[PDB]
Amino acid sequence: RLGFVAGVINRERIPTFERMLWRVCRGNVFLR
Amino acid sequence: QGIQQLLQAEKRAAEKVADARKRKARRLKQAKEEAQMEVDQYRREREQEFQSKQ
Amino acid sequence: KQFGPLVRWLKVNFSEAFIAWIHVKALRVFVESVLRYGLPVNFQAMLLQPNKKTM
Amino acid sequence: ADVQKQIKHMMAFIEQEANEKAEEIDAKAEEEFNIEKGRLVQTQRLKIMEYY
Amino acid sequence: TEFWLISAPGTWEKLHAATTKNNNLAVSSKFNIPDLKVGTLDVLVGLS
C-alpha cells in the first residue's frame, strides 16, 4: 500500500544509524 | 536482491484487496436484483385478496 | 467499624490490580515478540522464574 | 543471511494485512447485504400497501 | 523479591527445559498465555 521514504546521510554515522534504527522500530524494516 | 521480490508480493496483495472490492460489489448488485423477488412475492400475495374481496 | 470494611476492600482490590498488572505484562510479552521474531502463525511462548545474586 | 530473515517477516506481515483488510470488506458484505435487503423489502411493501 | 520474565522463541519448547538444567540460575517454568487476536502492523507497534 505505502512504505517508501527516501533521504541521505553521511558515511561517518551510516553504521551507527542502521544499528540504532533496527532497535527503535523492533525490526520490520529493510534498510539498504 | 530482495527489494524486487518484496514489491511483487504487495502487487499480489493489491489484487487480493481489490478482489474484496470485486466481492463486496458483487454481493451488492446481486442484492438489488434479488430484491425483485419481494416484488414478485407481494404481487401474488395481493392478487389472492384482490379477487376474494372482488 | 471502618477498619474491617477497608481491610476487606484492600484485600480484594489490590489482588485485582496485581492480576491486572500481571495481565498487562503478558500483553507486553505478547507484544514485542511478533516483531522481534517472525509471525508465521504465532511465536513460541515461554517464560522464566526469579533468581537471587546470580543475575 | 540475517537480512533475509527480515524479508521473510515482511512477507508474512503484508499478506496478513492483505487477509485482514479483505475479510473486513467481506464482513461489511455480510452485515450490509441483509441490512439493504431488509430496508428494500420494507420499502417495496409500502409502495404496494398504499396501492393495496 | 525480584522477578525476570523473558520469552525465547525459535523442539523449541524443549530448549526451555535446557535452561532448567542450569540449576544455579532458574527453574524455568512455562507460564503459558493463550492465543490472542492478531492482524495489525501499524496498530501493533502503536500499541507498544
DSSP per-residue string spanning A1-32 = ----------TTSHHHHHHHHHHHTTS-----
Cα gap C9→C15, rounded to integer Å: 10
Cα gap D38→D32, rounded to integer Å: 10
Cα gap C49→E28, rounded to integer Å: 5
Cα gap E30→E1, rounded to integer Å: 20
HSE-up (13 A, CA, CB side) for residue B12 = 11
Evaluated on CA atoms B35, B36, B37, B43, the torsion sign reads: positive
Chains E and C touch (3+ CB pairs under 8 A): yes
End-to-end CA distance of chain E: 27
* Centroid of chain to Cα E43: 22
What residue type is assigned to position E8 of the chain? A
Cα gap C49→E5, rounded to integer Å: 7
Which three three-digit cell numbers place residue A4?
517508501
CA angle B10/B16/B20 to nearest 5° reads 140
C41 touches chain E (CB under 8 A): no
What residue type is assigned to position C48 of the chain? L
What residue type is assigned to position C29 of the chain? V
Are D18 and B16 a contacting pair, CB within 8 Å?
Answer: yes
Are D16 and E39 a contacting pair, CB within 8 Å?
Answer: yes
Cα gap B7→D8, rounded to integer Å: 13
Cα gap B20→B18, rounded to integer Å: 5
Residue C18, C-beta contacts closer than 8 angstroms, at least 6 positions apart: none
Which among E6, B18, E16, A2 has a CA at the least distance from the CA of C25? E6
CA angle E24/E29/E33 to nearest 5° reads 150
DSSP character for E7? -
Cα gap A32→A21, rounded to integer Å: 12
Set of chain C residues whose Cβ sits within 8 Å of the Cβ of A23: none
Are A28 and D13 a contacting pair, CB within 8 Å?
Answer: yes
Question: Given in angstroms, what resolution was this structure solved at?
Answer: 3.6
What was the experiment behind these coordinates? Answer: cryo-EM
The Cα of A32 is separated from the nearest Cα of chain B by a number of Å equal to 9
Per CB distance under 8 Å, which residues of A are interface residues toward B?
A: 1, 30, 32
